[PDB]
Design a protein around this ligand. Structure first.
Ligand SMILES: Nc1ncnc2c1ncn2[C@@H]1O[C@H](COP(=O)(O)OP(=O)(O)OP(=O)(O)O)[C@@H](O)[C@H]1O
Ligand SMILES: Nc1ncnc2c1ncn2[C@@H]1O[C@H](COP(=O)(O)OP(=O)(O)OP(=O)(O)O)[C@@H](O)[C@H]1O
Ligand SMILES: Nc1ncnc2c1ncn2[C@@H]1O[C@H](COP(=O)(O)OP(=O)(O)OP(=O)(O)O)[C@@H](O)[C@H]1O
Ligand SMILES: Nc1ncnc2c1ncn2[C@@H]1O[C@H](COP(=O)(O)OP(=O)(O)OP(=O)(O)O)[C@@H](O)[C@H]1O
Ligand SMILES: [Mg+2]
Ligand SMILES: [Mg+2]
Ligand SMILES: [Mg+2]
Ligand SMILES: [Mg+2]
Lengths: 437, 437, 437, 437
């Protein structure tokens, strides 16, 4: 029943101001699941009587997946006015027709989802196409398309809060009734799992409906292990579009470095062949990641998205889970595309797979390796390391069994190296290059 | 000519009762091929004159595969009334229009095939959208969508009986004439092969039409070996939708355990990483399996569906057929993804492949193994077993050649173990964990 | 300009007879490229004035690939009559509407391309839907769909003759002008390459248009080596539809046995796991192969279709070309899926690859082998054979270097064995089974 | 604002002449991104008032990807005249209707994008379908379709010049403002990267819009390394269509031989199994390559297209980049499909990978090899060569360490061989065949 929305009509109304002359373009930028269309619909339903004519569209992306762009703009003209479709086999005649016919009128037009600029150029991209008092609202997942246009104001919509999330989930799961004084702990766990994103609340609300308490705990365990693919598909829509390196940057951040320092992240990505100046800016642009106190923290569910995508890959390019380490010991197949590693606690193998993975002869079979992390305290059952291949960019090691680094090691454009081990005599015998740090 | 249908109009009529006031929702839940649309059509054709207006749809799934949901509900309003299409570029205005326009009327509306709840919410999901006396009929393959709605009554439609199946097949194969007193044995074999499911009778009826007796026996042999893919595609439609573990549960049940005990099945699935509380409930929900006397018996054709799907897979994850055992002896490729086994009668190999498969060195190449079944009496040409890898969850062995279990065996969260062998001195030297049984 | 067509209007007219009362169904069955639609159009254009109303469709397959079956039959009613589309969201109401409205009229209706029986049932499948004097023409690639209906007469259309093919090609290549007294030899070679099938003549006619003589010879060489994929796609349309074994039967016939004896072919296919009673009948049914003097001769272009399809396959299951033999000597990859062989002339290897292929140790790496043919006279540089694996079904060997068969050979349900070699003392030492021959 | 276009209206106007009687067909042939539709639109907008009726279409390819050809020509008739759609379920009746109805009128019709001749035949393919004074304009990517028709004149549109490219990019990047006296060097580099092709200017203009100078240099580096896939997709559209050997010819030219001599190129392609008489002619025909001073120079961006396509391939069939050489040293996988090589400067390996690649034992693992180029001066750290496999067609070697060619070398239908080495005693001991040179 539109919970927490009334606080938004004031914010949207304030941006336009409703007393200025001419045309103003406002862009609503979200996250890909947070309330965007519902907010646009609320504004439409409140102010649609002030103008001579108004129109509203949903999911222009799907509309062009079923129809043609010329047809779409054909309907828009026939919606503002009551006239029937006018024949035009050329798009440009239609653009001139919109300019010539509806210039001397005040209208409100809402766009729901756009991804490329020719959409705006063919539909609403102008300044004098509309008369005085007209308002243009464009909803999109990234502000970049808005930036190329002359959008006066923009609004970024954040996730719901604890009280609002609980209220919405309670509304969906129990529309009339109330929990039988035994679901509060489960309520807290479920809502904490999502952390805003009302789409997830809607999906889970319809799932646990007239379901006994016996299935709720199983649902918690499944959600802990499985990403609940239904929401993951809607998030996956935003993933398609990254060209060559943004996927690698996003996968690197999601798999290993979620809340690390920015400067070291840019140093790593620049030294690894990616382009942080472009990749980081556009990833922030598309609301996949956000910067908070010089960190690159993302949403909880987006991390699960990246982890699942990394898992579904025939060559294991990202090993962080313990069982994937076991699968990587086959040999001659998975070594050539390891592209990273993350050693974990050893009380899951019970046969010495962990010691073999970082052994000398195992590391000679891999040739591309950038990230290697070993984070678990030494029990007293470790072995010295020999190879340390000549391709690493990020090094993290716990207690070091060996006396010092091997003499066959070259930094090889290293970036980050911290050693928490308490047994190191000297780092190196001489003074090597250390071009980057 | 709608055989056996007259007994159903009474059952459907009784549920609504036809004398109550307000609106009542009835959900017809079937199996994916049993008569569902035909029953809905019979009810429609019998009671369509009682109401002011009525409408009927087929295969809403396909309709959205060709059109948009907004267009679909646009036609529904234009069907109840004689008015032309009304322009609305937003779905919500259309929902309000249905509520505002057709509230003060009594109508009958039938939905043929739905899969997601937003379909019902956008089309028929309400209580006061329709006037007094309105009836809503929703046909679907699973009652779960009905459960989220306030459906008053539900009806599950079962397969046809022996007499009805024979009558329908005779109608299709010989619409006017009669069998020439030589097809009765073939008639019994063909009808027994299907076992209800009038779709299979329709498919086979049109195939053996003006065909000589010489081809009938060949058809029986082909049907024994081949699953007759045409029907298998319609059943395959229901398979798509299972998220991650329901496919594994269904494949496990179809391949090995069809009529086993429920409790051991849930113990196996819970111990193997799946979620029986969710998977079993939803598989029963989607009418893929049913529970009869604490068993998990399914339909005969669904078993062939699962077996064929398991066969078409580049990594042989399910070996039950004898020739697949031969193909699994290549080595270094099929061992790493064996994920189960089923040894069969040895009078098909004639070269000792069976003894090599369970040999000591063969079992060291496989690391993931949950189910292993060996069911054939010992001729006197067997060999002792050595490895018995440390990953099994289900064990079944015939006469045991070895004296006792190897000392290198750990139960490894075992679940089921029965030994029909008559040569066992002691199970183990000591007392191990045996956490699960 | 419709060459050779006038001889067909008489044949089609004679079948209906044009003086009978009631409704008659005639089915035109072709080959998949021979003139079918053009013949139907000629009959339509000649007799469309005799009836009150008439209609004609093209490529119902494509129409349902873009529209819905309900829409298709909606247009058919609106074509016979001048009335606008009538609303009906259920197909069955539309079928009853056709029966109720157009029963008392005489019409001519032509169907262009159908593949499944529900098309005919929903559109034209009845006897009293049409009034006296109505004619139904159904064009299809296989008579099986006609057989399930009560088609009175059928006509099979064959390829064009030498004179007609030359005339049509000359019309396409030189619509006004004439060859400059130097293209006659090239004309004969090109027309001989196609051998009828006016679609191929149309494709090649538009390709060699205002092209110099220098490119013509290159075109002949390319056509000799390349199958000219454009026509191959139209033929490929018919390939899709074979379920599991018809593809294997067709590939076996195209690759090796084109003009062999029928009885041995059925013996091979029955002994190899296929079903000749079904496969051969339906392949003849779909006009892929035809029987002439107890042979299985096919069209020339269909053989190139099968050969190309066999070539495009990552596992080399059909080796007949000489360079594929070289590619099959890699080892451990191609042996496990050889599924046949055809040794050819040895003056293309010049390094002894041919002798290695049939060597003893090479044949132990293959386990599935049915067809093996060795047809080239012994120069005096051959070696004795040792293994002769225990899976063959068809054997053909030239001059035999060895004295007799190896003692480790079992017939293994052999079917065909002829030996043209002049050096054989005895076939076997004893008397083995020889279950099939 | 249509920069540089005014010089084109005169050229197009001159071809028709605008004073002749009858109908004339003019074909505009471009490159796949150069201004073609905009030029056609300019001519339309200037001369559309002279005729009774006129029509214009865009992207007929997409129109048939969403609609049917019959529907397309249905709209064309309803555009010239004001009448509503006329029912016709057969295309041929529609063609006769166009001939019968609009013959006695003068019209202007523009086709935007065609790929197959039946499009023209069904729409505009005739001479007397239109009255005196009618003009037909057909825009297409290749003149071959025009050649089959009776097109009187053709116009090929070239890329923009330096001044025009700078003006257009400045218009897109700064529509109102001007560069802040610091972007001139960046302007020159960006425009030089594209070299005409206004589509690339449009794409890059919208990307660097209100972007700081810090991101511009990163964009230059990314464009140097990445092909900017957005434009590459539009160019990729033209790639689809080449049948079997044109792709191989194009990949060979793009990867290695861009500005080489024509005659040696045709000799190589003819000797390698391709058909230069067909392949070269049609590649020039489709405006992928052009001939300049007996060279095969292409556009700069098309070379990046070919290089990227060659890179995205699981079997490395084209090794020219230095890191791909490292990836090709795995062994037993990449050797069997090397199909060419290009050795580069050795100050990128620093471990001796280059010497191993051309070593004796490495070359025995490859069996298909046509092109091998080694272009870097000998530092004094090279090794003699032994194998030189018996399959090469093109040889290029720098300073030769060995005394002479190995005695196990056969020319093997060699084509090109130049040796810049200064240490060669004799080419061969005797006189071998040397069939081709
Ligand atoms: N604050 C809220 N109150 C009530 N319902 C909400 C709220 N936020 C979201 N929803 C519901 O959850 C769903 C979320 O989709 P939403 O309307 O946000 O589209 P969207 O996220 O803009 O679409 P996309 O991001 O894919 O373009 C909607 O169906 C909406 O009904
Ligand atoms: N009892 C019956 N009498 C006569 N015909 C039947 C009977 N049952 C099924 N059929 C025929 O067999 C076919 C089975 O399809 P049915 O009408 O059951 O659709 P459905 O199974 O509801 O579709 P789905 O399950 O894919 O949603 C129908 O075409 C119907 O004509
Ligand atoms: N005898 C002929 N005279 C003139 N033209 C012909 C002749 N036979 C075929 N053609 C031309 O060659 C083409 C062959 O296609 P045809 O009309 O035979 O369709 P079809 O083969 O029935 O289609 P399909 O087999 O794919 O269903 C047609 O476009 C037709 O114009
Ligand atoms: N000289 C020019 N002046 C202004 N704008 C141009 C010029 N040339 C191209 N453009 C713009 O760049 C884009 C290039 O596309 P264009 O109009 O050339 O279509 P096209 O290349 O004919 O399409 P295709 O080649 O894919 O069939 C157009 O949108 C056009 O607006
Ligand atoms: Mg939205
Ligand atoms: Mg149904
Ligand atoms: Mg046809
Ligand atoms: Mg264009």
């Amino acid at each position: 029943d539109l919970v927490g929305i009334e606080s938004q009509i004031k914010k949207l109304s304030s941006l336009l101001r409703m007393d200025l002359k001419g045309v103003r373009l406002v862009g609503i930028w979200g996250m890909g699941g947070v309330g965007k269309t519902t907010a646009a619909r609320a504004l439409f339903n409140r102010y649609y009587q002030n103008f001579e004519s108004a129109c509203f569209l949903e999911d222009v992306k799907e509309y062009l997946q079923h129809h043609t762009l010329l047809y779409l703009q054909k309907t828009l003209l026939s919606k503002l006015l009551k006239v029937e479709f006018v024949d035009c086999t050329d798009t440009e005649e239609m653009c001139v027709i919109l300019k010539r016919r509806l210039c001397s009128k005040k209208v409100l037009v809402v766009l729901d989802d756009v991804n490329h600029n020719d959409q705006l150029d063919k539909l609403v991209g102008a300044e004098d196409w509309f008369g005085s008092g007209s308002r243009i609202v464009i909803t999109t997942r990234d502000m970049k398309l808005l930036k190329n246009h002359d959008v006066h104001e923009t609004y970024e919509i954040k996730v719901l809060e604890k009280d609002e999330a609980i209220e919405l989930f309670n509304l969906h799961a129990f529309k009339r009734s109330s929990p039988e004084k035994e679901f509060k702990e489960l309520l807290n766990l479920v809502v904490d799992y999502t952390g805003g994103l009302p789409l997830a609340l809607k999906v889970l609300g319809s799932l646990l409906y007239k379901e006994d308490l016996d299935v709720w705990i199983s649902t918690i365990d499944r959600l802990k292990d499985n990403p609940e693919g239904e929401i993951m598909a809607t998030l996956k829509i935003s993933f398609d579009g990254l060209r060559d390196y943004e996927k690698s940057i996003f996968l690197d951040i999601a798999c290993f470095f979620r809340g690390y320092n920015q400067r070291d992240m840019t140093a790593l990505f620049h030294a690894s062949g990616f382009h942080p100046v472009l990749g980081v800016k556009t990833l922030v642009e598309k609301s996949l990641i956000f910067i908070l106190e010089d960190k690159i923290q993302m949403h909880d569910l987006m991390q699960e998205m990246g982890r699942q995508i990394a898992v579904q890959e025939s060559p294991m390019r990202r090993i962080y889970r313990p069982e994937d380490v076991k699968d990587a010991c086959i040999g001659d197949m998975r070594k050539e595309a390891i592209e990273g590693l993350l050693l974990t606690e050893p009380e899951q193998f019970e046969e010495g797979e962990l010691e073999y993975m970082y052994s000398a002869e195992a590391l000679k079979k891999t040739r591309r390796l950038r990230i290697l992390v070993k984070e678990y305290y030494n029990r007293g059952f470790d072995e010295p390391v020999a190879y340390l291949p000549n391709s690493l960019l990020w090094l993290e090691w716990r207690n070091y069994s060996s006396n010092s680094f091997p003499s066959n090691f070259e930094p090889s454009k290293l970036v980050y190296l911290t050693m928490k081990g308490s047994s190191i005599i000297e780092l190196w015998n001489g003074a090597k290059r250390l071009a980057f740090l």
